[PDB]
């Protein structure tokens, strides 16, 4: 165990020990979106695909952008693990981040 | 309840615990339903369910030429496994509907 701290029986501050193991809608939607790849190699999941609405408005039946209706991102709070500095098996932290999964169409 | 031997085998991670509208206005509106599991973190997950099979026009009626569809997300949860100790957690991934969007069939 060189380079990486240690915890006491006490378990204070509180810790958990985690056992390690072993679609077209974005295009057809009235509030269409692009997916953008977010990568953080110290985060689990390392890779998160985040939505970004194509336009400020929504798309009518003739395929035009009308500004009476708004494209808005549907956001989700999700859990991630972050391996914090100094980057040890015991340096992890839980985090909750807000990510856009897609876009929906709303009356202002 | 097990023990953190120095060994750390089988491998674990130790995780430091922290000191801490659109659903109604959408053309594909949704209800939120409460999912609670008292051995999971987050214990409570709010899952979307689209109000109708169709979308809602500007006069507020349900027209069936356009479809309300659920947008899904794979998310991380911790499950506290038996025997239910601070050191008995396991990572898991579940698919949950976050909301609904409006699509041309």
């Amino acid at each position, epitope marked *: *165990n060189p380079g990486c701290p240690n915890s006491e029986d006490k378990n204070f501050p509180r810790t958990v020990m985690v056992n390690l193991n*072993i679609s077209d809608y974005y295009n057809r939607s009235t509030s269409p979106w692009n997916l953008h790849r977010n990568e953080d*190699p110290e985060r689990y999941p*390392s890779v998160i695909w985040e939505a970004k609405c194509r336009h400020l408005g929504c798309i009518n039946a003739d395929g035009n952008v009308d500004y009476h209706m708004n494209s808005v991102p549907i956001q989700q709070e999700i859990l991630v693990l972050r391996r914090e500095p100094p980057h040890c098996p015991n340096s992890f932290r839980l985090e909750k981040i807000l990510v856009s999964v897609g876009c929906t169409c709303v009356t202002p | 309840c097990p023990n953190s031997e*120095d060994k750390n085998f*089988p*491998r674990t991670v130790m995780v430091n615990l922290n000191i801490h509208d659109y659903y109604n206005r959408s053309t594909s509106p949704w209800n939120l339903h409460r999912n609670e599991d008292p051995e999971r973190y987050p214990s409570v997950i709010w899952e979307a369910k689209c109000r109708h099979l169709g979308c809602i026009n500007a006069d507020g009626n349900v027209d069936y030429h356009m479809n309300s569809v659920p947008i899904q997300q794979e998310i991380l949860v911790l499950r506290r496994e038996p025997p239910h100790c601070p050191n008995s957690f396991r990572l898991e991934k579940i698919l949950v509907s976050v909301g609904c969007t409006c699509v041309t069939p």
Partner: antibody
Amino acid sequence: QVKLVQSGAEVKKPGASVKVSCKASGYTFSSYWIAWVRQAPGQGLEWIGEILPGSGSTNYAQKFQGRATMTADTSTSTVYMELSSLRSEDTAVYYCARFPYYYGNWDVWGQGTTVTVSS
Amino acid sequence: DIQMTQSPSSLSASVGDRVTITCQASQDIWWYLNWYQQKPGKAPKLLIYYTSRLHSGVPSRFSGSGSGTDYTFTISSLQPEDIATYYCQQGFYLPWTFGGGTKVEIKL
């Protein structure tokens, strides 16, 4: 000063056995795992098994179970790998190496023992 | 078993070049990836442990990086003393498995 010293080169016929010794110094012998890894000619390392001298607990690669036996003697700070029913393909340099478990690395290695299995 | 794919199996490069070797595991190994060096006529030597940490005394021209299933080993400036075979090894779960090796040589 953490150090592992192995017995000398061996030449054996197919079907024979070989027993290689690994003498540890410079650390608390009972509390670290010692492993055996071999290098067959040309390229390639391969893990054989490991022993914790303190308890006598062992772990073997499935390929070698029943054919390789590891033992340890706390009174002499020595571990032994015995490999039976030797075949030509067992020709290799055999190493012992200490295996701190937290990261699962072999940090100190013996000098190697050349085992030639030839008819 | 966790299968380790190491590439390439061999290579040659000039003094002072940058060499990159890859190692890929068949499942997430949580940064438990070590790198060994075996110079001709010598015992293997631990160079890097836990993906990126340098064993005591190892030159800093050697480094490692990666996460999940995908790892790299890099020699920043190849020196003549660096002619050797390099191996990766996962230390995540039994049995301990190795990549197939990369034999490194010097072009003059």
